[PDB]
Design a protein around this ligand. Sequence first.
Ligand SMILES: [Ca+2]
Ligand SMILES: [Ca+2]
Lengths: 313, 313, 309, 309, 85, 85
Amino acid sequence: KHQLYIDETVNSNIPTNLRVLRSILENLRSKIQKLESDVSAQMEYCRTPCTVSCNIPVVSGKECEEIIRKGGETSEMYLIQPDSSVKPYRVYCDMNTENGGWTVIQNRQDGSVDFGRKWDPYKQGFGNVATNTDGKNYCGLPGEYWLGNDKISQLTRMGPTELLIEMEDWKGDKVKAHYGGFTVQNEANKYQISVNKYRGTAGNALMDGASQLMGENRTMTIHNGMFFSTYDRDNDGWLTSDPRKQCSKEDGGGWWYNRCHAANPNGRYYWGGQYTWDMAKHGTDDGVVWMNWKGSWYSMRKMSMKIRPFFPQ
Amino acid sequence: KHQLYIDETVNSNIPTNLRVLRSILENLRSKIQKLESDVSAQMEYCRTPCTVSCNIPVVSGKECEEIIRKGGETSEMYLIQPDSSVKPYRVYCDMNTENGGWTVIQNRQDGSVDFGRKWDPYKQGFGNVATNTDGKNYCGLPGEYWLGNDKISQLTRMGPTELLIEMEDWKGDKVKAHYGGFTVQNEANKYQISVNKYRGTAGNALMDGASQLMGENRTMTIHNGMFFSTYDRDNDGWLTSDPRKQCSKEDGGGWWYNRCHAANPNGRYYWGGQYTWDMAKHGTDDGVVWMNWKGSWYSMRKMSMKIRPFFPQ
Amino acid sequence: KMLEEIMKYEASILTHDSSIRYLQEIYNSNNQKIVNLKEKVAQLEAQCQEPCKDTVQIHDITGKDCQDIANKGAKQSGLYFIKPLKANQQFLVYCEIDGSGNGWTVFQKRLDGSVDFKKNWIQYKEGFGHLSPTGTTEFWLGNEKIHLISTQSAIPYALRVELEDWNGRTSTADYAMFKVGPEADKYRLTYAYFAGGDAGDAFDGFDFGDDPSDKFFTSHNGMQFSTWDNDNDKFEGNCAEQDGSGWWMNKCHAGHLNGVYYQGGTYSKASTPNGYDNGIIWATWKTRWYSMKKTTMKIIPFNRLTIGE
Amino acid sequence: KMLEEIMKYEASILTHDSSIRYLQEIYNSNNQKIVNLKEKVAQLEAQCQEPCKDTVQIHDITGKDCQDIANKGAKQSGLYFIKPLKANQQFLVYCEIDGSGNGWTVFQKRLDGSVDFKKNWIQYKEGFGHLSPTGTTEFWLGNEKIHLISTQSAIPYALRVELEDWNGRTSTADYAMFKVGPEADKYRLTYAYFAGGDAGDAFDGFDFGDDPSDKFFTSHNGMQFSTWDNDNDKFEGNCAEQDGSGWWMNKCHAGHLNGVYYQGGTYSKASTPNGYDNGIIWATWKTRWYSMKKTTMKIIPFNRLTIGE
Amino acid sequence: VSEDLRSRIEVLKRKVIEKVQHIQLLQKNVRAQLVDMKRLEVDIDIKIRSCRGSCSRALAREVDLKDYEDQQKQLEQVIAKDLLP
Amino acid sequence: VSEDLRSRIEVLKRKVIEKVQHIQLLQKNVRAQLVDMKRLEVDIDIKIRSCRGSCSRALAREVDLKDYEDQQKQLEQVIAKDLLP
Ligand SMILES: [Ca+2]
Ligand SMILES: [Ca+2]
C-alpha cells in the first residue's frame, strides 16, 4: 500500500528546477542584447583605422645585428635588407637587452592582433611592428606582429642564427628561452622548424615537449623537425579522419604543430593568464602557451621571438 | 405577468458583441506588432543617408530667367544669385514648360519630405532640390522641397513676379493656376502673401477661397493678404482660446492660413488622393489641397510652385 | 426548466464576466503598445529631417583668379568662387592646384563626350557644361569669363594645354602672353609667343601639304572667336558651322580642341558625309584624323612656372 | 484531502506545463540571437584584419642620385631609394624637388633639436637621425653616403646651404665643385670655389678679430672630418670633443652646422662652463654666438642651376 | 426563508444589466481605439515615405484600409440593442 | 463506471513523469546554451581587443565570469533527483 509515496512534494519541488532555469534563461537572453550591443559599436569604430607615422632611422643593414654595429643604439623600428634581391623591410630591433641586435620576429603583448589567421598571412607576415611613442617623431615601441614566414625563413638560412624567446606572467614574473640553432626552411619544405641549443629559465619545450606529460605523451609535443601548420593547411602529426584531432582549428594560431603542442606563442590571447575549457572556442588549448613553465590552460601576458646571428662564443 | 420577457436570448445574444469585439481587439494587437516591426527597420535604413552628387552647370544668373537667356536650355539644378550680398543658392530651373525660366519654389511629387515642419525650416528652406538622373553626372530632376521663405520673399521683391501653380490627380489629370502678382513680404511682416492676376484651370482658390462654400464661409478661406503660419507660430484668422480652432496643428504644413484654407500645397502627403477624417492626424484637412478643383478631402499626387519675373505681355 | 434552465443563466454570466474582464485586459495592454509606438515614431521622424548628402562642396576661399587663391592659402583642387578685378560679380570655376603653389584656373576640358560642343554664340559667351570638384566633367568655362580673367589688371598670363591620346601618353604646349579680348573684339585670341610644349605649336599654323598657303591659313594667333551663329573667321562662310563648334577659326584650323569627340581617337573622311578636321585635333602633335581622349585649357599668371619642375 | 488535494495536483501540472512550454519558447529564441550574434562577429573580425595605416610611404622611382630620379620622371619631394654608380647596395635618402626639375639630394638638416649631434665616428660614417618624407625630422645622412654620391662617375657636384634665423629670414651659400673623399682620407671636405650665396662664405675662413691668423685657421676647405673619437683636425687635440659634434675641423671653425642647437638662437660664453662657437654658426652670416633655427645641406649636380630663378 | 421565485430577476436582471453595461461601454471604447489605429497606421505610412528623402533606403510598404474599413463597419453595426424589460 | 480511486496514479504519474522528462532534458539543454554563452562572450572579448590594432578606437570592456561561474554552479547543482516511485 504505497499511496504515501505520493510525491505531491514533486509538484511543489519542481518549481525549483524552474525558477532557476527561468533565472539564467532570462539572464542569457539579456546578456545577448549586451553582446549584440557592444559589437555594433566596434563596427562603428572601424569606420576609421588606427594610423602610425614612422619616420625612418637613416641607419640600415642586413638585420638588426649589423645595424647596431653601424651605431643603431636605440630601440625602435628600423628598415633592413637581408638581400639586395628582397626589397627592404621594416622591423623592430631590440638594441637594449643582451647586446642588442635582436631582430624581433614575433611579439605578443596586449592582444591587439588576430593570430587566428590563415596560411597566407603567416607566410607573409602581419600586424603592427612599432607604433608611435608620444611627441617623439619615430615609432620607438613595437606592437603585436608576425614578421612572416618567408622573411623569417630567409633570415635563418642566411647563416648561424640564435633565438631568444621571452615571456611574462600576468603577475609580473618573467622567463626566457634561448636557442642557438633556429633555422626555418622555405615554404617548399613547409617551413620545417629546427632548433639546437637550449639554455634558460622557461623550460626547453620546443625540443623536449611538455614536462607535465610522459612516455609517448611527451614525445608527441616536441616541435623540432615540425612543419608549420595553420587552421587552413594541416601539417601536424595527425591522420585523415574525424577532425576531432586536428591541431589548429578555426581562429587558432599558426605554428609548427605536432600531435599538437608544448608551446604556442601565436595562440589566442585570453586576458589574465587563467583560461578554461568552457572558454576556449573549441575546448582546446587555444592560448599562448609554455607548458614547461606555466603548464596548460594559462595564456601568457607577453611573449616574443627575437633573432640575432650568433657570432663565436 | 412578464416572466416571458426573460431575455435568456440576451445571455445567448451577448456572445455576439463579444466574438466580434474579441476579433478586432486581437486584430489591432497584432497589427501593432507589425507597425512596431516596420518602424524599427526604417530606423536601420537611416543609419545611412541618401546621397546626391550634383555637378554644377557653368551658367548662372540672378534667377532662372536670366539663366535661360544665357543659354540655360536644359532642366536641372542650377545655382543662382539674386544679389551679390546673398551667397549663391542651388535651385531647380524649369526650362521646358512655358518659355522656361521657371524658378521652382516648391515641389510635391512623391511624399519624400516632412513638410510638417516648424517656422524656422520654412523660413530657410528644406528637402531635396534635384537628385541624380542615372548615368548622367548632373542632377537633372527635382525632388520635394521648399526653397525657404527669405530666399523666396527675397525674389518677389526683386521686381514684378509671376506665379504658376500646377497639380496632378492620382488618375493622371492635371491643371494649372497662374498668378501674376506673387510677392511675399519679409519675415518682419510675417511673410505676408499677396497675389493679383489669376488665369487658369485649377480655380482661383488663393484670392477667392473655396468654391464649395458661401457667404462668410467663402470669405474666410482667401489666402491673399494672409500672414504665413506654421504649427509652431500661429498667424491665422483665429482668437486665443481652446485650440480646437488653430489652422496648423502638429506635423501640419506651413502656409498662409486664414480661418484655415482653400489650398495647402505643403499639406500632408496621403497616398492615392482620397483621404478620410478618421485617417487625418487630427481629423482635419492635413492634405495637399485645392478645393476649387478636387474639393476637400483629396490630396494631390503632384503639386509645384514655380516663379519667373513677368516681362511685358 | 423552472430553475433548471435558470440556475444555468446565473452561472453563465460568470463565464461571460470572465470574457468581459479579459477583453478589458487586452484593450488596455493595447493602448500601451500604442502610446509607445507613437513615441517610437517620433523617435523615427526626428531621424528623417535632413535632405540627401550632396557630395559636391565649394570652398569659400575666394580670389581674383585661382592663383590669387592658392596664394591666399588654398591647398586643394576643386570648385572655387573668384572675382576678377574688373568683374561685377563672382563666378564658379574649377581650380587645379599642385604641391608647388600653382593656381591653375581651368577653362575647358573634355574627356567623355557628355557635353555636345555645338553651342551657339551666347552659349560660348556665358559658358556651358558642368564643373565636378574632381574634374570628371566636360565644360567650356565661357569666353566672357576666359577673357575677363585674361585681361584683369594688366596681369601677365600663360596657357598650358594638356592633351591625351588613348594610349596614356600626354604632352603640354604653353603660350606665354595669353590674353583673350572683348566680345566687342569677338573675343579674339592672342598670345605673344609659343613656349615649352612638346605637343608642338599648332597655334603658329601648319603646312598640311594640301596646299602651300596652309601654314598661314591654319595659324590661330590674333584670331577672332566664331560659332555657327556668329562668323568672324578668315574663310568664306564659317568653319564652325562646318566642323561643328565654337573656336578661333581662320580659314579654319591647325589645332582646335572643341572638335567633335571621336571615340577611339582615330577617324577618316568617311565619318561625316563630307569629312573634316572637325575632330579634336592638334596636328603639331598628331594627324588631323586623330581625336584626343582628353583635353584641358588652363591659364596661370606667367610669373609662375618657367619650364616644368 | 482524498481527492480534494488531488484534484488540484491534476490541475497544477497544467500551470507547470505552461511554464515548461514557455521556457522552451525562450531557449529556442535564444539560440537564435546566438547563431546570429556569431555571424555578426565574423562580420566584425573580417573588419579588424588590416594593421594601422603607416602614413610614411616610399616612391619606387630609383636613381644614381635625386637628380637622376627627378630626371627619371619624379615629381615630388620625399623619401627615395638611390644607388650611386660605385654603390654596392642602395639606401634611403630624402629628395627635395622643385617645379623646375631639381633633384636636391639632401644630407643634413636641423630644425628642432630632436637629434643630439654628439655622435661617434661610426655614427657619422653610417648616418643618424630619421627621414620624414616631408622633412620635419633632423638627420645626418652619413659621410660615407655623402662621399659616395659626391664622387660617383666623375660627376660635378655643388652644395647649396640653406640657413634660417628665428625671424624667418634665410640665405643660401653655394659651393661649386663639392666633393667629399674616402674614409681613408677621413672624408675630407673639398670644393673648388665659392658661388652665389648671400649667407657669405664661411668655408673660406673668417678673421674673428681674436687673432690675425683666424682666417687661415677657421677656413674649412680641404679639411678632414673629425668626431670626438677620431681626431684629424689642425688643432692640438680635437675641436669636436670640445664643441660637441662631428665636422671638418681645422683649428676649429668659422662655420659649422652640427653645432649644439641653441633655442632662441642667441647665446653667450655663459652657456657652457667654458663657452664656445659650438652652436650652429655661420659667422659669414651672423655672430659666433648666434645659433641658426634651421639648417640644410643638400647637393645637386653642378650642371643644374647657375644662379637662382 | 423563500428566495428564488422572484430572486431570479434581481440577481439576474441587475447582473445582466451590469454586464450589458460593460459590453456597451467597452464596445464604445474599442471604436475609438480603432480610430486611433487607423490614424496611427496611416501616420506611420507617411512618416516612412517622408524618410525616402533622408535615409539611404526606404521601406516599401502599402497600407490596406479594407481591413480597418471592415471592422469599422462591423462594430458600428454590432451597436444595435441589448436589454430593456 | 468507476475511475478516480486508482486513476489518480496513471493520469498523475505518467503526466508528472512526462512533465519531469522535459524539465530534466530541458535543464540539460540550458547547460550547453550556457557553455555556448561563455565561449561566445569570451570570443567576442578577444575579437574586440584584436581590433585595437586595426580600427581607430577600441571598446574598453571587461568580461566578468563570476556571473557565468555562478549559474555554472547552480544548474549543475539543481541536477539532483526528481521522481522514482
Ligand atoms: Ca567668313
Ligand atoms: Ca689634433
